[PDB]
């Protein structure tokens, strides 16, 4: 007698292992996409390393014009009294000046007899890059994964 | 004889069936969620874009604020020129009104006659958006998939 | 005439204290700025700082920082220099320069003023 | 705060041209236009030669003229004389308040 046994024993290891197969693959593309989402999230994250590097960028840009201004404003006043126009002793043009000082900022560098150069932090460069505003943060996307599906062997006909 | 090889052969299709039902589950789950996620993505650049923008309007701002001083430091020291209060041709004030047209950047427009204009780029809307301050990137979220039951052949008793 | 006149030479124990003095004249005390040079002898000059006649503002080289004051009386228009905690190296001839808006130019020079550090 | 570079000493005949170079960074020389050039004599206080890198003070003889390349300064003396001999310096405003005078040239005659 032929013992079919066999037989049906072909048929469960295939529905077993195509399901393995389906479970395999899916843990891969979870595995694809938990990957490409960490990319995507650190290259969001360099896009704001650039940004924030523009606003210090601006803000050295905010001093230079103060040490522009509040100089230029005192070699004025200086120059009043050096011409003999306002008394050197006047005191409100003294408070001026010592106003004027206070509110030079980081950049102003004295260079000697009352003048004052804006060492400026923010150069052509740094001027080209606020201006361009070239930002792009670009595209993002993330996989589709095809369906997956368990066969049943086929049972082989021995005709 | 009642041939049961039938029965169990429903079985088992069951088991596959049952099974494969999960698995496009899973796989519409995984896109489920990538399809949403990329959009969140999108939505954060979004507001990055935005936040760029910002700092351009800011930056602006500033540009015209060096428009405003420094033509009208000049303002006033062409006035004390054209007042006779000291000589037109006293060295220091010429070299300090070179300074400030140096200085004057490229929002500043000279309008004829020693005078300039700040033609002002960051317009009452752009100052109105500044001052806002009405960002905001929104809230994220992601959907909860719940867990999926495979169910063996009930095998009917047939009474 | 533009001039001006430093104090006479000093001799001090190591550790103690120096002032020099700089009378200015024949221009406007306020309108320049005082820089003191110090130079020791058959050496090169060495500079030590600038002062503000006008508002008694300040620099120090970073050599002498915390060790040097500039200070100035206008009533009388005279710069003073004070050094502190003097040693052998300080030996030398301090001078007193006038420094004109916006110019490179140290003009003129006192005459020097001799310090000697020794025990 | 390097000292800026000069020679030790140059020699040269009466009448001759000679010249002294004053090298330093470009902070310093070249990237400000307020370097000068003091004479010094034995006995005497430091007399100032040029400013501005070519500016001459009432009262110096044209033959002193100076000049700027760079972060190097230079002072050319024609027609050398008998009061040329004598120690020479270059000063230069270096950045942040601060002014550097070179190590001097001691100019001598032959």
């Known amino acids: 007698g032929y013992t079919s046994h066999g037989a049906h024993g072909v048929a469960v290891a295939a529905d077993l292992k195509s399901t393995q197969e389906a479970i395999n693959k899916i843990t891969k593309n979870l595995n694809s996409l938990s990957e490409l989402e960490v990319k995507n999230l650190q290259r969001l994250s360099g896009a704001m390393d650039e940004i924030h590097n523009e606003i210090l960028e601006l803000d050295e840009k905010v001093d230079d014009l103060r040490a522009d201004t509040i100089s230029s404003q005192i070699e004025l006043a200086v120059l009043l009294s050096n011409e003999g126009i306002i008394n050197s002793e006047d005191e409100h043009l003294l408070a001026l000046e010592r106003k004027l000082k206070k509110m030079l900022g980081p950049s102003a560098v004295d260079i000697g007899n009352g003048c004052f150069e804006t060492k400026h932090k923010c150069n052509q460069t740094c001027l080209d890059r606020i201006a361009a505003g070239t930002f792009n943060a670009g595209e993002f996307s993330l996989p589709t994964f095809d369906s997956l599906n368990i066969t049943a062997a086929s049972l082989n006909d021995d005709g | 004889g009642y041939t049961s090889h039938g029965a169990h052969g429903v079985a088992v299709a069951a088991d596959l069936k049952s099974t494969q039902e999960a698995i496009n589950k899973i796989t519409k789950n995984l896109n489920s969620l990538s399809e949403l996620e990329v959009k969140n993505l999108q939505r954060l650049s979004g507001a990055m874009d935005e936040i760029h923008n910002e700092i351009l309007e800011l930056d602006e701002k500033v540009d015209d604020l060096r428009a405003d001083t420094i033509s009208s430091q000049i303002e006033l020291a062409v006035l004390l020129s054209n007042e006779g209060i000291i000589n037109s041709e006293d060295e220091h004030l010429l070299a300090l009104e070179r300074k400030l047209k140096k200085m004057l950047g490229p929002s500043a427009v000279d309008i004829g006659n020693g005078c300039f204009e700040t033609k002002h780029k960051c317009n009452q809307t752009c100052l109105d958006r500044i001052a806002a301050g009405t960002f905001n990137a929104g809230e994220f979220s992601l959907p909860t998939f719940d867990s999926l039951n495979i169910t063996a052949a009930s095998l009917n008793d047939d009474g | 005439q533009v001039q001006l006149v430093q104090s006479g030479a000093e001799l001090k124990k190591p550790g103690a204290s120096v002032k020099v003095s700089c009378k200015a004249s024949?221009?406007?005390?306020?309108?320049?700025?005082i820089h003191w040079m110090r130079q020791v002898p058959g050496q090169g000059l060495e500079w030590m700082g600038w002062?503000?006649?006008?508002?008694?503002?300040?620099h120090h080289a970073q050599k002498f920082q915390g060790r040097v004051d500039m200070t100035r009386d206008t009533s009388i228009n005279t710069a003073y220099l004070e050094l502190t905690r003097l040693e052998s190296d300080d030996t030398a001839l301090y001078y007193c320069?006038?420094?004109?808006?916006?110019?490179?130019?140290?003009?003129?020079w006192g005459q020097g003023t001799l310090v000697t550090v020794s025990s | 705060q390097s000292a800026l570079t000069q020679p030790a000493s140059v020699s040269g005949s009466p009448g001759q041209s000679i010249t002294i170079s004053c090298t330093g960074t470009?902070?310093?020389?070249?990237?400000?236009?307020?370097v000068s050039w003091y004479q010094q004599h034995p006995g005497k206080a430091p007399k100032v030669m040029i400013y501005?890198?070519?500016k001459r003070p009432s009262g110096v003889s044209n033959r002193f003229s100076g000049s700027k390349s760079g972060s190097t300064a230079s002072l050319t003396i024609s027609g050398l004389q008998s009061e040329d001999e004598a120690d020479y310096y270059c000063?230069?405003?270096?950045?942040?308040?601060?002014?550097?005078f070179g190590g001097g040239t001691k100019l001598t005659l032959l």
């Open positions: 320069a006038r420094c004109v808006f916006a110019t490179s130019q140290f003009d003129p």
């Open positions: 024949g221009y406007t005390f306020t309108g320049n700025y």
């Open positions: 002062i503000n006649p006008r508002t008694g503002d300040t």
């Open positions: 470009n902070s310093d020389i070249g990237s400000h236009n307020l």
């Open positions: 501005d890198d070519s």
């Open positions: 000063c230069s405003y270096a950045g942040s308040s601060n002014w550097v």
